[PDB]
Design a protein around this ligand. Structure first.
Ligand SMILES: Nc1ncnc2c1ncn2[C@@H]1O[C@H](COP(=O)(O)OP(=O)(O)O)[C@@H](O)[C@H]1O
Lengths: 550, 78, 78
């Protein structure tokens, strides 16, 4: 019964230790406090142990990430199996190849983890009827499979989300039990003693909202620790929530509690001495503030008991995360203009507001700000909360980004968030030039969904030319095929090869129009001149060989 | 037009060809220990069929026989 | 045609000179009503496009069949 569990837990297993803790939770306390707490300070240590490497980055001892994904009859995929990298995985392909579907399925899978972290036995999102089941599929049902990894104790936690179509005999059911188990471990361990929770964020195409200047007043919902899980796997990040939280941080940094609790104590001391003689009518209806003093005492110990970071520290961390990732932003702060507090940034040395930001900068700013806020709120026990566990899905990472910014969008994200498993999709080879070949999964141009595995490209994309990545990886010609002027160099090469090498009229006219169109020192003209040079020298060598002997 | 490098500047592997240029031209255009190490790194990272290794080996071939011809000319120029 | 606007809290407000556009559009509209003519198309496709879903609501908005429904939300961005 418990002997094998005790033996296995010492071997590095949390699930058996979790079962022991749960089974001894309701037993007799006091005498068994040590034994029930020994399993607690083995399950909590599993989630909390970690060391700082030589680079000064906190590396968790047991990392959490998704290993493999299997899609069966899910949209255009008859049966697709994907192996995901620990740190960064990039999915590339043509339009309508299912790259968005993979991220959508992963988000649906992570929804159950989020829901069961939030509420006891919560239910996450489940697949669609109208659009998710593959058309012309003989089974009229589909399922998606995940095999997350949480260290040596949990090498594999299989997750299955399944659905049948409109009209069937057997309704396929899900297998979310391991996800429920792991999230229950996380939730109850956190509730007994605060720990660091993983952040699961999805960023879809629908994150280009034009932003609203009007934000609701801070009621208090944006400061709860379990608010980073609100609409996190829903496409757009909650940037309005971030703005409200940032303004809250600014207000509480410029006001603080040491400048209010002492004033409350002074008011209580003055009033109690005033009402000492009698006539307590000046305190009966002033007792509201005296009770609000104790109310403010509450919700403040939680800021000391949960080891949450100082509001100024959180503000500084979020600010340095925003400025060091977004290239145009230099610093960000809040001002009281005409009474209302509004957030201002610094773009290229100018001090525009958020609403004046361009769509390219605003979307990336919203993404990084929401991610930083969620990491700070979910990781209160780290010196740098950005070095926390999590899985973040981004669709079209290069969206609204200039090619200059695409050369540094992956490196900045990796440096700011070292311990997050990034699963992204891209359409640009400039981004691929900064990514290892092992981290790329590609869809073949001739692929209707009958394939079973996503392979890496044959060429090493990291540090390669843009043209080479366009040609070998994305199967795109360097020059546009639909433009007649783009074939002039090849035509000149062929018309010089078939001829003896001398510039005849046919080659001369083509060379002249190439010069007139592209220019005097275009690359095309230089290449044509080099071809002329090499052909002339080859003809000279042939003439020399002929003259040597017969 | 876009005012952007075709090869990313923030990647250490992008300057390997230039570093090979320097470490090859240093003595006479011939390979040595560090040049061979850099060539091995280029071959292992970019691959065999990569144009980077093709450029590196063409550079090696050009420089070795340039050095040979330079020695040949200097022999008669004394 | 000139569009002008003054900032908040400015005593002097600048006006817009939009009369010639009104004159040209009056020509178009009057001639069209007297005898049907071909009308120009003015469309703006900004970032507000690419929004999810399609046909969200029945959209009781003015009988898409009628000709002048082509100018409805034509410069909205999406
Ligand atoms: N239920 C379905 N059955 C069959 N094909 C589908 C289904 N849903 C989507 N597709 C097709 O699969 C592709 C889905 O596109 P998407 O997943 O967004 O890919 P990408 O992000 O690479 O453009 C489209 O080509 C679409 O026609």
């Amino acid at each position: 019964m418990t002997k094998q569990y005790e033996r296995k837990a010492k071997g590095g297993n949390l699930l058996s230790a979790f079962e022991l803790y749960q089974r001894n939770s309701d037993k007799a306390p006091g005498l068994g406090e040590m034994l029930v707490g020994e399993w607690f300070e083995m399950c909590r240590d599993y989630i909390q142990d970690g060391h700082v490497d030589e680079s000064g980055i906190f590396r968790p001892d047991n990392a959490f990430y998704l290993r493999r994904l299997t899609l069966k009859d899910f949209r255009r995929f008859s049966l697709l199996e994907i192996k995901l990298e620990e740190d960064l995985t990039v999915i590339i392909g043509n339009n309508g190849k299912g790259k968005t579907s993979i991220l959508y399925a992963i988000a649906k899978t992570l929804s159950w983890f989020v829901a069961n972290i939030l509420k006891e036995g919560g239910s996450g999102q489940r697949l669609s009827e109208m659009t998710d089941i593959k058309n012309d599929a003989e089974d009229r049902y589909s399922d998606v499979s995940s095999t997350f990894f949480f260290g040596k104790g949990l090498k594999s936690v299989p997750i299955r989300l399944s659905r049948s179509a409109l009209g069937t005999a057997e309704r396929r059911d899900s297998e979310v039990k391991p996800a429920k188990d792991l999230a229950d471990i996380w939730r109850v361990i956190n509730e007994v003693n605060t720990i660091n929770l993983p952040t699961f964020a999805l960023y879809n195409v629908e994150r280009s909202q034009p932003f609203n200047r009007n934000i609701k007043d801070n009621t208090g919902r944006r400061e709860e620790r379990f608010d980073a899980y609100s609409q996190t796997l829903g496409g757009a990040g909650r940037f309005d929530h971030f703005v409200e939280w940032y303004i809250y941080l600014h207000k509480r940094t410029v006001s603080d509690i040491s400048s209010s609790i002492k004033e409350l104590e002074q008011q209580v001391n003055d009033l109690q001495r005033t009402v000492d003689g009698g006539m307590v009518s000046v305190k009966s209806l002033l007792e509201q503030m005296k009770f609000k003093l104790s109310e403010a005492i509450e919700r403040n110990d939680a800021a000391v008991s949960s080891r949450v970071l100082t509001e100024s520290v959180q503000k500084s961390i979020v600010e340095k995360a925003i400025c060091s990732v977004v290239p145009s932003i230099s610093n960000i702060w809040v001002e009281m203009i005409t009474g209302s507090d509004l957030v201002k940034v610094t773009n290229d040395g100018h001090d525009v507001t958020i609403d004046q930001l361009s769509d390219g900068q605003r979307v990336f700013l919203s993404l990084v700000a929401d991610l930083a806020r969620r990491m700070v709120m979910l990781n209160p026990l780290l010196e740098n909360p950005l070095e926390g566990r999590g899985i973040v899905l981004i669709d079209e990472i290069e969206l609204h980004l200039h090619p200059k910014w695409q050369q540094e969008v992956i490196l900045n994200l990796r440096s700011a968030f070292p311990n997050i498993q990034f699963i992204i999709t891209t359409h640009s080879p400039i981004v691929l030039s900064t990514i290892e070949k092992r981290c790329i999964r590609e869809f073949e141009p001739n692929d209707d969904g009958d394939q079973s595995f996503l392979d890496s490209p044959d060429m090493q994309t990291k540090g390669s030319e843009n043209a080479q990545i366009l040609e070998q990886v994305m199967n795109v010609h360097s020059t546009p095929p639909g433009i007649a002027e783009s074939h002039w160099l090849g035509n000149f090469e062929l018309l010089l090869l078939d001829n003896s090498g001398e510039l005849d009229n046919h080659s001369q006219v083509l060379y002249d129009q190439i010069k007139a169109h592209f220019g005097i020192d275009s690359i095309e003209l230089k290449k044509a001149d080099s071809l002329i040079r090499i052909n002339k020298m080859k003809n000279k060598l042939n003439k020399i060989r002929a003259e040597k002997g017969k």
